Amino acid sequence: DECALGANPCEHAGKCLNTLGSFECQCLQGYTGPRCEIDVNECISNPCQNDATCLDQIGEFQCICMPGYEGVYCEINTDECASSPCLHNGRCVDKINEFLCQCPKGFSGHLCQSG
Amino acid sequence: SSSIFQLRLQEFANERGMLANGRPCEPGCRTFFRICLKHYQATFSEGPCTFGNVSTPVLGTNSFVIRDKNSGRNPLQLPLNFTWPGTFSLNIQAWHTPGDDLRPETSPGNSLISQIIIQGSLAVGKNWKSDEQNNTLTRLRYSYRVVCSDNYYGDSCSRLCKKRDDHFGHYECQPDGSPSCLPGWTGKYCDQPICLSGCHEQNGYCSKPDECNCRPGWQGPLCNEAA
Numbered sequence: 001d002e003c004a005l006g007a008n009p010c011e012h013a014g015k016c017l018n019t020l021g022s023f024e025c026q027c028l029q030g031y032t033g034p035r036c037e038i039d040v041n042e043c044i045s046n047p048c049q050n051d052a053t054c055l056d057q058i059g060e061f062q063c064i065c066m067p068g069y070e071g072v073y074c075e076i077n078t079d080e081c082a083s084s085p086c087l088h089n090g091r092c093v094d095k096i097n098e099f100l101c102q103c104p105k106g107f108s109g110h111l112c113q114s115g
Numbered sequence: 116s117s118s119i120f121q122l123r124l125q126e127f128a129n130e131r132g133m134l135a136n137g138r139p140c141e142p143g144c145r146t147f148f149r150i151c152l153k154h155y156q157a158t159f160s161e162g163p164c165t166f167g168n169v170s171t172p173v174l175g176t177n178s179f180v181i182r183d184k185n186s187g188r189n190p191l192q193l194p195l196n197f198t199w200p201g202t203f204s205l206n207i208q209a210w211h212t213p214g215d216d217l218r219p220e221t222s223p224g225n226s227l228i229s230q231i232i233i234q235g236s237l238a239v240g241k242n243w244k245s246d247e248q249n250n251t252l253t254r255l256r257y258s259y260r261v262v263c264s265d266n267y268y269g270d271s272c273s274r275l276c277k278k279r280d281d282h283f284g285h286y287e288c289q290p291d292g293s294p295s296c297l298p299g300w301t302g303k304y305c306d307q308p309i310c311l312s313g314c315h316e317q318n319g320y321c322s323k324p325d326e327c328n329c330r331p332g333w334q335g336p337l338c339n340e341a342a
């Protein structure tokens with residue numbers, strides 16, 4: 001009906017739908033406003049933890065993690081000792097984007113594997 | 116992309132034509148640049164160019180002034196997949212290539228000359244922020260900014276305005292992205308005609324500017340006379 005009168009009033013490839021005696025836009029995901037002219041800020045809810053950075057993207061957000069963190073919300077501290085890296089029964093200590101091996105006496109090296 | 120990071124290279128000095136490894140460029144340092152843009156990080160640099168990267172052809176040999184080329188372009192353009200965070204990290208590398216200047220980045224013999232690393236806050240705007248980096252071997256002079264793409268507006272480039280002169284609107288675009296109504300129109304999208312002066316607010320109306328039409332039961336030029 002009314003969508004027929006002119007060039008698509010809905011920005012960003014939105015979908016015009018006639019309503020009685022006027023009209024409305026069905027916007028593609030990530031866009032808002034009556035004529036879809038506004039880029040929705042998906043980072044408003046502050047989903048990103050541990051000093052991560054939230055990138056507002058089109059229809060979705062992305063969290064860029066500080067080094068050593070992972071997961072959708074950067075809510076997971078990566079376990080650098082999961083693979084059991086330390087040799088000669090050294091003690092792995094999980095740190096921030098790091099792992100420290102504490103050697104028993106007489107052993108040295110990063111993985112505590114020496115004379 | 117709704118916004119663009121623009122970087123203008125202005126001057127580079129390498130008077131003794133040396134490489135990072137201490138060897139002299141032979142015969143001269145045929146210099147091209149590599150740009151790595153990413154999110155702000157204070158810790159020692161980790162990982163890829165998250166905001167994008169670009170390389171230039173060779174712009175000069177040893178010391179040279181770099182001039183703009185609207186259409187080897189300068190300023191360089193990095194179009195962004197996201198709303199501008201407000202902070203950033205920028206890494207600029209100066210390189211020497213012994214090969215031909217077409218995509219020097221793909222050439223096998225390349226050697227680094229020097230590089231700089233900056234980080235900070237930047238607001239979207241047309242003003243160029245200017246910087247210099249001096250060291251004993253080389254000097255780099257440049258400036259940068261973040262501006263909206265065509266038809267994007269606002270402090271975060273999140274508002275789109277495209278001018279119309281048809282049934283849905285009659286407007287131009289203001290700097291903030293709000294429509295600026297052509298004469299005789301009103302409303303947010305400038306789709307409301309301004310009826311003839313004194314046309315009765317309740318009893319009269321217009322579909323065209325400077326007109327007065329009467330609703331049922333009314334008459335006169337201003338539609339204010341009952342029956």
Ligand SMILES: *[C@@H]1O[C@H](CO)[C@@H](O[C@@H]2O[C@H](CO)[C@@H](O)[C@H](O)[C@H]2NC(C)=O)[C@H](O)[C@H]1NC(C)=O
Pocket residue numbers: 247248249254
């Ligand atoms: C880096 O070097 C340039 C030129 O070698 C410097 O530019 C001059 O800076 C002085 C003060 O430092 C000004 O009085 C001059 O007017 C500048 N030259 C021109 C042509 O404008 C620049 O200042 C140096 N940067 C630093 C931090 O010392």
Ligand SMILES: *[C@@H]1O[C@H](CO)[C@@H](O)[C@H](O)[C@H]1NC(C)=O
Pocket residue numbers: 162163164165167168169
């Ligand atoms: C540089 O950009 C290209 C695409 O333009 C991408 O494939 C590559 O991974 C980027 N490099 C880094 C280090 O981010």
Ligand SMILES: *[C@@H]1O[C@H](CO)[C@@H](O)[C@H](O)[C@H]1NC(C)=O
Pocket residue numbers: 057058116196
């Ligand atoms: C960049 O933007 C396009 C469309 O705007 C999207 O399809 C693409 O996935 C984006 N890139 C990333 C890495 O999300």
Ligand SMILES: *[C@@H]1O[C@H](CO)[C@@H](O)[C@H](O)[C@H]1O
Pocket residue numbers: 041042043044045046047061
């Ligand atoms: C706020 O956090 C929610 C998680 O429920 C996320 O889905 C939204 O995109 C974000 O704005």
Ligand SMILES: *[C@@H]1O[C@H](CO)[C@@H](O)[C@H](O)[C@H]1O
Pocket residue numbers: 079080081082083084085099
């Ligand atoms: C397994 O071991 C590797 C050693 O390279 C370590 O880097 C990982 O953190 C761990 O999972």
Ligand SMILES: *[C@@H]1O[C@@H](C)[C@@H](O)[C@@H](O)[C@@H]1O
Pocket residue numbers: 051052053054064065066067154155156157200202
């Ligand atoms: C976005 O990335 C995170 C990891 C931090 O470095 C922030 O300071 C930045 O804004």
Ligand SMILES: [Ca+2]
Pocket residue numbers: 001002018019020021022023
């Ligand atoms: Ca209708």
Ligand SMILES: [Ca+2]
Pocket residue numbers: 030039040041042056057058059060
């Ligand atoms: Ca968005």
Ligand SMILES: [Ca+2]
Pocket residue numbers: 068077078079080094095096097098
């Ligand atoms: Ca850890």
